[PDB]
Design a protein around this ligand. Structure first.
Ligand SMILES: Cc1cc2nc3c(=O)[nH]c(=O)nc-3n(C[C@H](O)[C@H](O)[C@H](O)COP(=O)(O)O)c2cc1C
Ligand code: SF4
Ligand code: SF4
Ligand code: SF4
Ligand code: SF4
Ligand code: FES
Ligand code: FES
Ligand SMILES: [Mg+2]
Ligand SMILES: [Mg+2]
Ligand SMILES: [Mg+2]
Ligand SMILES: [Mg+2]
Ligand SMILES: [Mg+2]
Ligand SMILES: [Mg+2]
Lengths: 156, 226, 439, 90
């Protein structure tokens, strides 16, 4: 069972009056609910749909369209490396290999215990600076396959 | 109100799109996402016709019939080689991911996708790779759900939500993995959901009441009743 | 190093040395909000728009359309008193990193440019449609908005004249298609980010059925200097037909990657070897993209033409964000083009068939070609995708640009594509009792 | 029920040519000449042979896209496993 907390419901209701249409707060409501819990559970869809005033179908379409609104159980510290043209050139492949050799998983999976999900991301908009990756909200650039272990040991 | 289609000169209502006017004149243009009740959206890209100007532009540009205003000084050509090839390749792209199951589809001899595939003259598969697959939902005791056969034309969603105001059907996902169904298994609440069995051009939504005791369209015997 | 001066470096000139942002006090100190004050208390709408049209400012997002015409398109009638100005801070393009600099280190520049543009447009609200992966940028933008609000630069009665312009920030989830001009509007409405057909243009019916002009970050950063220093000064920065300054940079394995502000007539070789340093220690130049990923490759011969819209447009390619990428010799072209097409295919939306269903086919063909399992008719099938995904065949501009690096790499390096075709075309599986139809 | 009127069948072979699942075939053997003409109407029980006929290894349902007891949604020939829209991958 799912029910919206008081803090996140209040934040959604405060976001709903930044726009002319309540619907417009849908992405921000999903991001609030995800911030609190790490992902958007199946009941959060209907809860947000009841708070805003739009159906659960629209909220579920918004949540499954965008790639940073997780609809499946994701660990903590959702690692997102970049694999686009500028990074492909700078060698993000070695960075992905040293990441999935240390986490012992494949891109798209949790590790064992609910920490260090591994995902690829479109581009982090920091191309001139080596292969990049974000862990949760910290952008890490100039990545070297030697410094992946020590950089992962900072997140517990 | 006087368009030129392949040299011929017709008289049309200048207030509707070129697909509507050309279909009213009796010509044959393929189209998946247009419906004369749900307006025109340019999604499927399958009703492409070459459009010239000056009556002497020998190098027109491909444009969708359902989205051009069909004004007075309009010169198009449905049969242009480039337009033919694009319309054909457009169905080939849809056929890249289709399921090899016409024989077991609820609607053979009644499917619009079959009509348009035979119409665009495409009977050869160059695709070689895997097809995307989808899991079905339980939509009720009335209509079935086979998302493997979806061509993403958006007719179901447009009708069900913008026309009939359904509120429990939409589109999910993106990037060739798009999905059209309910947010969760369950019966469809809208009173007018049966029309999804004929709005959908493919055999994604097909009624169960006929699927139990099935018979191909040719075998049926109809009569005008109320 | 570079000697910045307010004359030649209107954007990058105030940027303090230690990379920390420039807050409201230091900004105003370095002649900040002077252009906004001039525009608000010495000009009027329909005059700022003409000043921007005469200055010749052009779209810095990648399209290249004139900003003055963009703003003029707005309807002229006071029956529509609710208008929106949306900054396109969503910067997703594999190779562009220019808005990060601007709205991380100079948030007040963007705030003031947006204030001036929303006064010119008679818009009461402004939404900075942010990226989401820009954490520090969002923090700095919100801090700058709060400072300008507390200091009178934002709010109901802005510096005497009656003009409200409440300014908001919208950090969205990560999809590249929301960068599109009229898909950004959908995403801001809280819907799925699907583009919209034009006409009607966003200028006449946009955000919520109201008028709306979507502008990039650099375009809007360009305006404060135009108003503050004058229209002629901006007209005369250099003798090129694209007036103003531009953020240009070289990405890739160059000796000093980054971005700089250049007079918009600079040859691409003058950025690679003078500023960016050149290929580094043992690497050899092979090709380059002018602008973000989504522009045509160019060989070494095209390295001397000036970086402007008309020159690179006539050279086959197109100047996008003017942030080049240098591809060195050690990069297989088929692998690189596969890495680009899989992004362009996975990052699409589902609306139109040519993009949604034809880009994955190209991705699979390129994977087979780079694995060594190509077959006759593959390159001739890729080339057919570059003609049928071009402009006009698809609903938006995502696929026309998605298929530009593919055709541009085929043209120049067909040998690296053919080298992958090592199989006999076969598609059937030889059913036992049926005899195949021969050729 | 499957029923074929053998008092009308001209043995053209058009049926076998149309069957997309290779179910019905024409085999080298003649029908007995019945006594009543009613007994010339075969009703599936008579027709269903025990074997695969001329084409030994063809299995239509190994090609079809819809699920049966044997194969699931992603287990057909030249098909990919179904990716859920609620996935995490971009
Ligand atoms: C697929 C696609 C993605 C785009 N992404 C961006 C983007 O990330 N940032 C941007 O400023 N413009 C982007 N644009 C260009 C915008 O549509 C729009 O023209 C621009 O943001 C604002 O116009 P301007 O260049 O005149 O300022 C994109 C266009 C397309 C077709
Ligand atoms: S939807 Fe039409 S084309 Fe597709 S399998 Fe069914 S009958 Fe064949
Ligand atoms: S389910 Fe049917 S109507 Fe809906 S998009 Fe797919 S093919 Fe079109
Ligand atoms: S080309 Fe079509 S499918 Fe691709 S992003 Fe644009 S509208 Fe969506
Ligand atoms: S061969 Fe088949 S199709 Fe032809 S007459 Fe006999 S039963 Fe009818
Ligand atoms: S391609 Fe990785 S940071 Fe841009
Ligand atoms: S029917 Fe016109 S684009 Fe689909
Ligand atoms: Mg009409
Ligand atoms: Mg199933
Ligand atoms: Mg089921
Ligand atoms: Mg779903
Ligand atoms: Mg149907
Ligand atoms: Mg506009």
């Amino acid at each position: 069972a799912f029910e919206l907390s008081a803090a996140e419901r209040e934040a959604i209701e405060h976001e709903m009056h930044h726009y002319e249409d309540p619907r417009a707060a849908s992405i921000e409501a999903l991001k609030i609910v995800q911030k609190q819990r790490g992902w958007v559970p199946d009941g959060a869809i209907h809860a947000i749909a009841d708070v805003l005033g739009i159906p659960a179908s629209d909220v579920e379409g918004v949540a499954t369209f965008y790639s940073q609104i997780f609809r499946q159980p994701v660990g903590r510290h959702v690692i997102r490396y970049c694999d686009s043209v500028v990074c492909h050139i700078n060698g993000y492949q070695g960075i992905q290999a040293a990441l999935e050799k240390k986490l012992n998983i494949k891109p798209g999976q949790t590790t064992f215990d609910g920490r260090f999900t591994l995902l690829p991301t479109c581009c982090l908009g920091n191309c001139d600076k080596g292969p990049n990756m974000m862990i949760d909200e910290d952008t890490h650039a100039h990545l070297t396959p030697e410094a992946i272990p020590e950089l992962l040991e900072r997140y517990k | 109100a006087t368009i030129h289609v392949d040299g011929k000169e017709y008289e049309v209502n200048g207030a509707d799109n070129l697909l509507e006017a050309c279909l009213s004149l009796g010509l044959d243009i393929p189209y998946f996402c247009w419906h004369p009740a749900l307006g025109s959206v340019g999604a499927c890209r399958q009703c492409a016709v070459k459009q010239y100007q000056n009556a002497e532009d020998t190098r027109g540009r491909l444009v969708m019939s359902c989205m051009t205003p069909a004004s007075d000084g309009t010169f198009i050509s449905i049969d242009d080689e480039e337009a033919k090839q694009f319309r054909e390749s457009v169905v080939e792209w849809l056929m890249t991911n289709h399921p090899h199951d016409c024989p077991v589809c609820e609607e053979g001899g009644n499917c619009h996708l079959q009509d348009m595939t035979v119409m665009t003259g495409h009977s050869f598969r160059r695709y070689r790779f895997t097809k995307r697959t989808h899991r079905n939902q339980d939509l009720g005791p009335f209509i079935s759900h086979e998302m493997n056969r979806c061509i993403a034309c958006y007719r179901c969603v447009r009708y069900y939500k913008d026309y009939a105001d359904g509120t429990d059907l939409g589109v999910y996902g993106a990037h060739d993995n798009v999905y059209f169904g309910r947010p969760e298994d369950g019966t469809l609440e809208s009173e007018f959901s049966g029309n999804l069995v004929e709005i959908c051009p493919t055999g994604v939504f097909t009624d169960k009441t006929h699927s139990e005791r099935y018979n191909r369209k040719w075998d049926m015997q109809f009569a005008p009743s109320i | 190093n570079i000697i910045r001066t307010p004359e030649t470096h209107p954007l990058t000139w105030r940027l303090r040395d230690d990379k920390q942002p420039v807050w409201l006090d230091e900004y105003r100190s370095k002649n900040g909000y002077e252009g906004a004050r001039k525009a608000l208390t010495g000009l009027s709408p329909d005059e700022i728009v003409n000043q921007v049209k005469d200055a010749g400012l052009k779209g810095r997002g990648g399209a290249g359309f004139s900003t003055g015409l963009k703003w003029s398109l707005m309807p002229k009638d006071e029956s529509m008193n609710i208008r929106y100005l949306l900054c396109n801070a969503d910067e997703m393009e594999p190779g562009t990193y220019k808005d990060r600099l601007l709205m991380e280190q100079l948030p007040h520049l963007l705030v003031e440019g947006m204030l001036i543009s929303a006064f010119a447009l008679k818009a009461y609200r402004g939404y900075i449609f942010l990226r989401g992966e820009y954490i520090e940028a969002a923090v700095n933008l919100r801090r700058a908005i709060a400072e300008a609000t507390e200091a009178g630069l934002l709010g109901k009665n802005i510096m005497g004249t009656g003009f409200d312009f409440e300014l908001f920030v919208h950090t969205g989830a990560g999809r590249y298609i929301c960068g599109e001009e009229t898909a950004l509007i959908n995403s801001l409405e809280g819907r799925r980010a699907n583009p919209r057909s034009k006409p009607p243009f966003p200028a006449t019916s946009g955000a919520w059925g109201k008028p709306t002009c979507v502008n990039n970050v650099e375009t809007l950063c360009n305006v404060p200097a135009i108003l503050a220093n004058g229209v002629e000064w901006y007209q005369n920065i250099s003798k090129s037909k694209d007036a103003g300054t531009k953020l240009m940079g070289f990405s890739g394995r160059v000796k000093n990657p980054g971005l700089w502000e250049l007079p918009f007539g600079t040859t691409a070789r003058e950025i690679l070897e003078d500023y960016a340093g050149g290929m580094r220690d043992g690497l050899k130049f092979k090709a380059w993209q002018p602008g973000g990923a989504g522009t045509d490759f160019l060989t070494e011969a095209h390295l001397d033409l000036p970086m402007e819209f008309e020159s690179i447009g006539k050279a086959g390619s197109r100047l996008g964000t003017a942030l080049a990428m240098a591809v060195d010799h050690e990069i297989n072209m088929v692998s690189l083009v596969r890495n680009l097409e899989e992004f362009f295919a996975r990052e699409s939306c589902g609306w139109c068939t040519p993009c949604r269903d034809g880009l994955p086919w190209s991705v699979k063909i390129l994977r087979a070609l780079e694995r060594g399992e190509g077959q006759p008719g593959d390159i001739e099938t890729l080339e057919q995708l570059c003609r049928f995904l071009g402009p006009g065949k698809t609903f938006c501009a995502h696929a026309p640009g998605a298929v530009e690096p593919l055709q541009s790499a085929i043209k120049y390096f067909r040998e690296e594509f053919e080298a992958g075709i090592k199989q006999p075309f076969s598609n059937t599986h030889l059913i036992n009792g049926i005899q195949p139809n021969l050729l | 029920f499957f029923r074929i009127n053998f008092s009308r069948c001209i043995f053209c072979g058009l049926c076998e040519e149309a069957c997309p699942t290779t179910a019905i075939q024409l085999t080298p053997d003649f029908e007995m000449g019945e006594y009543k003409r009613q007994d010339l109407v075969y009703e599936k029980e008579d027709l269903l042979i025990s074997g695969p006929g001329k084409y030994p290894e063809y299995n239509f349902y190994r090609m079809a896209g819809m699920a049966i007891d044997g194969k699931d949604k992603g287990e057909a020939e030249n098909e990919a496993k179904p990716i859920d829209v609620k996935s995490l991958l971009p």
